């Protein structure tokens, strides 16, 4: 019951569509460069609420917020984010559809707000546990909690 | 009986088939770049549906489906994907056979669906065994499951 799209950089003439609830939601891809309007798109900033307000139009029944960020997918109590998958067009770096369970402590997202729980899962290289991380900002930092329930 | 072929970002002018069965399947060159139409091109997304869509007209008796990543190959019980490789044009960043053995973690496809399991070789290394992986997920995670026979 939430989690989050970080955006990076989405270049030219990559349909970028967010898979929650199996419905295609947030429909967009970059425009092809034919410069000047085109150069100020692809950031990463103008996507942030481009693909936020077209969830905000789509199931509906939820409020979006972005920071710097993400996209924070965040469900009342009646729905849940089942089959959340987010096409990227590009390679796997431009957009991520990021959850509550990493699978290394570098597979992580920059800003992930404040109240926000990774169960990060061991990466199968060392002998190590599934310890939490907890992310508590004003300072931006992945500290160590205790478990949720 | 399954595995997959990742997608990123076929630049222009490069000859990618898929060589299932012995057979030349799924060919396809992303077209040099004059401009417009071409960039919407270079991506891996349009790529993943336009390389599926031959190989649904060719051995023809199985069915495709792509999410994010891959194109997943899926025969029935009667053939299997014997001499599986596939054509990159650009170097081996380019698109991936990937089967059910990596011979890392790192080397390791980055959605390949949620019923899918890995035999990690060891990296002759460390003095590791030879674990296995299945993606489970939900959540992108690579846990450390039984064996499957």
Redesign the interface.
Known sequence: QDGLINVRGGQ????LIV?INGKDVAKY?IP???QPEHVNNTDAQWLAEELAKQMRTNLSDWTVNVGQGFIHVTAPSGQQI?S?????????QLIN???????SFSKLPPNAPNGYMV?I?????KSADQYYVRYDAERKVWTETLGWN
């Open positions: 030219y003439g990559r349909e898979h891809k092809d460069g034919s089942d959340f998958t987010t096409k990227d067009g590009y390679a796997d559809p990021v959850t509550h369970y990493a699978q169960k899962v061991g990466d199968a290289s």
